[PDB]
Design a binder for this molecule. Structure first.
Ligand SMILES: C[C@H]1O[C@@H](n2cnc3c(N)ncnc32)[C@H](O)[C@@H]1O
Ligand code: MET
Ligand code: SF4
Ligand code: F3S
Ligand SMILES: [Cl-]
Lengths: 8, 306
């Protein structure tokens, strides 16, 4: 599944 | 459909706003683990879905490591399209009437003492999925006599008898999320309305249920409008509220208009406490089901009552 991005 | 194409225009325009850099306080608490892999096997074993997966929640490794997870009933295709939500829009498959039993069975396998359940909108069904939602609560309680159930519902278009059917199943918490403020509501959740969703909470309150809602910040609202919405929720009879930060799933989704600072969330939580909510939880990666059982216990013990 495709997890929303957090700070990189 | 004209509506899908109306939204296509907006989504194409969304993508003209480049993806935002996330602030440093937005970070992932965990990594994959045995518990995650085992929970995922079970969910797939039982032909189930979770909103944790389908909505792309960043807390999935944290929650699932703790054996906390929220089921998504009614399939993985929603008949509605909200501009923060990455769950697929589509034509649902046939109603799986065996799904409530399998959710219930999965809860038993997990040994949950508190179960959180949500699902998609089912505008394809004659009853909008009212029976499905009710039967899932019933099935869990039958198989798991001492397990509390928190059910996060769509609005069933506010239809009193659809609502009554769901309420009659008697979840420990009935949640329905207003998400945003009246000035921008239509732009975010066009298949709902602010007042109809408030009315759903009031109906649940009047039916004797503990109620819960949620606000997603960073969608264009001001903090003053947030305070007004908290007042609206409280006055409508909402008992528990979560206050949270929007994460943009993709370029085609609504831009992040602001990053609410952790200190601001502390202030919102204090304001809500001050209005008399029984349960309040605020923070950027707080979500409607996040640590919900612990929040429920706190609410259940509050002077506030609920
Ligand atoms: C399942 C619940 O998750 C929340 N939700 C869904 N997508 C997002 C997002 N991008 N950001 C924040 N909250 C979200 C909504 O409150 C919904 O009710
Ligand atoms: C999975 S989102 C929460 C439940 C319902 N689909 C709603 O948006 O009201
Ligand atoms: S109704 Fe719920 S599942 Fe459907 S698109 Fe809106 S937020 Fe997502
Ligand atoms: S808040 Fe937790 S229950 Fe779904 Fe999101 S991973
Ligand atoms: Cl309906």
């Amino acid at each position: 599944e495709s997890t929303x991005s957090v700070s990189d | 459909a004209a509506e899908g194409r109306r939204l296509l225009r907006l989504e194409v325009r969304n993508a003209q706003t480049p993806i935002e850099r996330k602030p440093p306080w937005i970070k992932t608490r965990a990594r994959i683990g045995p518990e995650y892999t085992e929970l995922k096997n079970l969910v797939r074993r039982e032909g189930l879905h979770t909103v944790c997966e389908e909505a792309g929640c960043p807390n999935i490794f944290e929650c699932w490591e703790d054996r906390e997870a929220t089921f998504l009933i009614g399939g993985d295709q929603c008949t509605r399209r909200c501009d923060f939500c990455q769950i697929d829009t589509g034509k649902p498959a046939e109603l799986d009437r065996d799904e409530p039993r399998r959710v219930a069975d999965s809860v038993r396998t997990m040994g949950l003492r508190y179960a959180t359940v949500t699902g998609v909108a089912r505008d394809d069904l004659p009853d909008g999925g009212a029976w499905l939602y009710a039967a899932t609560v019933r099935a869990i309680k039958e198989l798991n006599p001492s397990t509390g159930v928190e059910l996060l519902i769509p609005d069933f278009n506010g239809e009193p008898t659809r609502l009554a059917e769901v309420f009659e199943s008697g979840p420990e918490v009935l949640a329905h999320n207003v998400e945003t403020v009246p000035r921008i509501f239509k732009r975010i959740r066009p298949a709902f309305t602010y007042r109809r969703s408030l009315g759903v909470l009031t109906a649940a309150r009047d039916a004797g249920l503990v109620t819960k809602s949620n606000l997603i910040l960073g969608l264009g609202e001001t903090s003053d409008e947030v305070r007004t919405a908290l007042g609206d929720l409280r006055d409508a009879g909402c008992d528990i509220v979560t206050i949270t930060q929007y994460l943009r799933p993709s370029a085609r989704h609504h831009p992040v208009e602001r990053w609410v600072k952790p200190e601001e969330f502390v202030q919102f939580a204090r304001f809500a406490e001050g209005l008399g909510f029984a349960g309040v939880l605020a923070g950027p990666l707080v979500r409607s089901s996040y640590r919900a059982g612990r929040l429920y216990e706190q609410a259940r013990n509050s002077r506030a009552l609920a």
